From a paper:
The abundant ssDNA-binding protein, replication protein A, transiently engages the single-stranded 3′ tail, but is replaced by RAD51, whose nucleation on ssDNA is stabilized by the evolutionarily conserved BRC repeat motifs within the BRCA2 tumour suppressor protein. RAD51 bound to adenosine triphosphate (ATP) arranges itself on ssDNA into a dynamic, helical nucleoprotein filament—the presynaptic filament—that invades duplex DNA to search for a sequence homologous to the ssDNA tail. ATP hydrolysis by the catalytic activity of RAD51 allows the components of the repair reaction to dissociate.
Sample preparation for full-length human RAD51 assembled on ssDNA in the presence of the ATP analogue, AMP-PNP, with methods for electron cryo-microscopy, are described elsewhere (‘Materials and Methods’ section). The fitted PDB coordinates, refined in REFMAC were validated by FSC to 4.1Å. The overall architecture of the human RAD51 presynaptic filament with 6 protomers docked into the EM map when viewed perpendicular or longitudinal to the filament axis reveals that like RecA, human RAD51 protomers form a chain that encases ssDNA as a 1-start helix to create the presynaptic filament. The angular displacement (twist) between protomers in the presynaptic RAD51 filament is constant at 56.2°, encompassing 6.4 protomers per turn of the helix. ssDNA (red ribbon) lies between the inner surface of the protomers and the filament axis. Moreover, our model with fitted ssDNA suggests a stoichiometry of three nucleotides per RAD51 protomer in a filament with pitch 103Å, incorporating 6.4 protomers per turn. We also carried out 3D classification and refinement with imposed dimer symmetry; again, no observable widening of the α-helices was detected. These observations suggest that the protomer–protomer interface in the human RAD51 presynaptic filament is invariant, similar to RecA, but distinct from what has been proposed for mutant yeast Rad51. However, in our model for the active presynaptic filament of RAD51 bound to the non-hydrolyzable ATP analogue AMP-PNP, the binding site for the Phe-X-X-Ala module is buried in the RAD51 protomer–protomer interface, and therefore likely to be inaccessible for BRC repeat binding.
Numbering used by the authors:
A (entry chain C), B (entry chain B), C (entry chain A): 20 to 274, 284 to 339
Write the structure that this text describes.
Amino acid sequence: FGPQPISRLEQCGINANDVKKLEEAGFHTVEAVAYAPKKELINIKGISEAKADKILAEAAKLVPMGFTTATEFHQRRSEIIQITTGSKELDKLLQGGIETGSITEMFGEFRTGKTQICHTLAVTCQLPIDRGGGEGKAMYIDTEGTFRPERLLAVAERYGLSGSDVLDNVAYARAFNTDHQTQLLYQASAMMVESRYALLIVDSATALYRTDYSGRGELSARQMHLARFLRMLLRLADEFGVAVVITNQVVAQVDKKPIGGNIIAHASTTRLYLRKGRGETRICKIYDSPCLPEAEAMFAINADGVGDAKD
Amino acid sequence: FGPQPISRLEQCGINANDVKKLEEAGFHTVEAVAYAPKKELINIKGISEAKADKILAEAAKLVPMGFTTATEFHQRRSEIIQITTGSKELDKLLQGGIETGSITEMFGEFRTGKTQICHTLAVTCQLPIDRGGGEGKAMYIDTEGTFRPERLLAVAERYGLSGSDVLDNVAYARAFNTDHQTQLLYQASAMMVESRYALLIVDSATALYRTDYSGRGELSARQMHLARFLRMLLRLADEFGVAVVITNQVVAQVDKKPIGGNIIAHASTTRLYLRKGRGETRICKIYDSPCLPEAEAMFAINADGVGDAKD
Amino acid sequence: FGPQPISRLEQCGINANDVKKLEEAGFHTVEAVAYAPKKELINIKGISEAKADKILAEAAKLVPMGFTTATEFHQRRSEIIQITTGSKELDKLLQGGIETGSITEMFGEFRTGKTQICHTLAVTCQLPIDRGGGEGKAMYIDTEGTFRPERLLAVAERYGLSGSDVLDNVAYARAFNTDHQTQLLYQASAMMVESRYALLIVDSATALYRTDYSGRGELSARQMHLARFLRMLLRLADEFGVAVVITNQVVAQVDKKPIGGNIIAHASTTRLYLRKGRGETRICKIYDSPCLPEAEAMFAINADGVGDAKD
Ligand SMILES: Nc1ncnc2c1ncn2[C@@H]1O[C@H](COP(=O)(O)OP(=O)(O)NP(=O)(O)O)[C@@H](O)[C@H]1O
Ligand SMILES: Nc1ncnc2c1ncn2[C@@H]1O[C@H](COP(=O)(O)OP(=O)(O)NP(=O)(O)O)[C@@H](O)[C@H]1O
Ligand SMILES: Nc1ncnc2c1ncn2[C@@H]1O[C@H](COP(=O)(O)OP(=O)(O)NP(=O)(O)O)[C@@H](O)[C@H]1O
């Protein structure tokens, strides 16, 4: 029920031809269709004045904000679900868990468990609201080929759900390059129209972007392309309130650091760092998150997935 | 009491039809209606000569400057309120605080606390004049979705005010694109007609402008659009004397820098830089401000908001 | 004593009605009334032949040049006062200072100190001729709202003058748009009739002109309007010999530059560039000035105003 469909903005100014171009353009709702600047709609082989009428009409009949106090907004935030991670110590750290209708991503070294957390979340989101993760199908865009359904099965056994049913409600595709990476998101937006989603794990979203192209010159272009990809996610984030989790790679300071420069920085509504401890033990620390201060946690990696310190 | 309303410029040349177009055009006062060039009024389906009469009539009965010495002006500046930041060290830096009827904005890296300062100011402005921040409702245009009423509650507890009352006097809306960004300002101007305002925090005003469009070609257009947005703010700044605070993003030099190019530069009646120090500690330094020289400060981020170096 | 009044051109052809229109037209002298071509006077609801008689009469009794050698003119240039800047290094650069009965303007980046220099000059012009700046009241048209009387007080303390008296002899108004910008100049011309003036700082004269209107189309109009504004200044420059200083904004080359195209180019009787150096230090360099070739200078910004390199 979360969004209002495109076929709803059919007041008296949605003809066949009019709405024959908006869907194909990549608009499968009224929200993301309003959210768009005159700039957007005009660049899609429409008529200047015809397209302008389309905007104003929909906008009046979509609640396009206009200083709606703060008390009312405060209540809005109380209704937002927070997904459980499976570790009590990790849950405590997030004062509940991973926020929806936001951007939340972790980076660390290889072996640290960023890929791990994603698999665990893919299952934990397939539960009753009362048991943390609220009902809603999970989508996984992997870029590393590090998807392992077997890992999901072990998590399903811990939480005592039918593996086969859980795997029906997690959806997968592999993005293989930058242009594909962006392109895949348009398919994503269509997917969440038909059925209610809760979760995105985009495995290594930004990690592809380093091998992708350039290096040090015509990187301007990379930052532009990433920023464009990232704004789309955020569009997708407020439109439906699906929870965006991105995986990140790191680079040494050489004079230990989340890659992609700053563009990813300003995007992040919540940041996390992983590093390896002794044996199976691992450390998560918050980096940048508006809500709660910087804090550390012990947790471990069990055969059941991401759990508390077995010791 | 700060402005004179549109229905005041009703001497003998404000008919129904005459004043039926000025409001809808985006004029909710006599100040901003005078401040306008013949250019402005003429571009709004009015009559050349009819509109010209409207200008001259209002202008004579609005004190449209004309070399009113400097001693008189000096006294005017003594009457301007300076908002407190909550950190004594930070307050000292601004020889009182954030000037009203101006443009004051900070930029830094992610995690630095630009968003932080905004939330803190949103509360500090809801106080008696004697306790720094003068009485007058706060308006928050966010673009990042980094608004957290919870953060405001912690600040309210420190200063011992009713959270619920404070949240009634802070107003919120999210701008989602360039055209929306500008559009939202027209609603803003109407808002401050009905009730007395003190504060604007526009979170990431300029930060939206990078993902917004183009890059390196047809950027001319971006600068034009930003400059237009920025002049409107300034219009709003002298008209009512509401205090404008803008958040900014940064870009690496690649051969560390406030984005949007120079257009934002000339706008700024006061500039600030934030960077991260060791632990919870942070550094603010002044950049460009006509009044006081370049100086540095230690401050920290407490659970109460932006405070002094706990140490 | 600098000009001859309008009521002086009352030989035998200045009636009530005749001189009832020239003042209101914007003529408060014989100089600017003579400099005007037939075109001017005829466009102000006068009689063709009546207005023609008005021209010829005044012209005969105003010394309207007529190829007056070179040697005599050379002596005229020796009598022109040159205002001090307060920095010995900066003074040396101008072989004395800012020429009067001319157009002298600086541009640079934000933070560079163009606004700074203006404030400093506003005080330095309130002195005995022997101490640089010659006696005569200062007028400041600001467009940015970057006027700070406090800055003038610090300068007054250095030069040991009564702040209150100095502020009585600096006059201020804010121009808020193009039409206002031009309009304000007519009030200016009247101001200098009653009392002897020395100085104009027009803060950001041209800087308003970019946000003002258009962009890339119907810019021909901007050029026309600026050129008209600029010619008026020059009229004001030869008429009274009041010293015109204009502030300018800059634009990136995008393939660092004084804004407003070429029209400002030909106007400039002397040009200056500012850029930031290390710490409080700044560099001024001459651009285009007929008199002395291109040279560079170190100077600094002290709490006393614009001074020499403290080091
Ligand atoms: N079934 C399992 N039970 C317990 N531990 C496991 C299991 N499978 C793998 N591990 C270990 O748990 C750790 C998890 O980190 P891992 O998620 O593999 O890092 P990562 O995020 O994949 N790095 P990248 O390869 O760049 O994506 C590894 O060090 C593995 O050896
Ligand atoms: N309740 C709290 N008490 C103390 N510290 C906090 C609290 N909440 C968050 N923090 C931390 O304080 C810092 C504030 O910086 P922050 O305001 O989040 O940067 P920012 O301006 O939001 N960057 P952006 O995400 O681009 O808008 C962060 O590094 C947080 O970890
Ligand atoms: N009282 C003071 N003493 C010493 N330095 C100061 C003082 N006040 C301001 N400054 C600094 O001196 C510099 C002067 O430049 P400034 O005149 O502010 O540039 P500008 O011409 O105003 N640019 P714009 O904002 O476009 O008009 C700034 O970088 C200030 O931080």
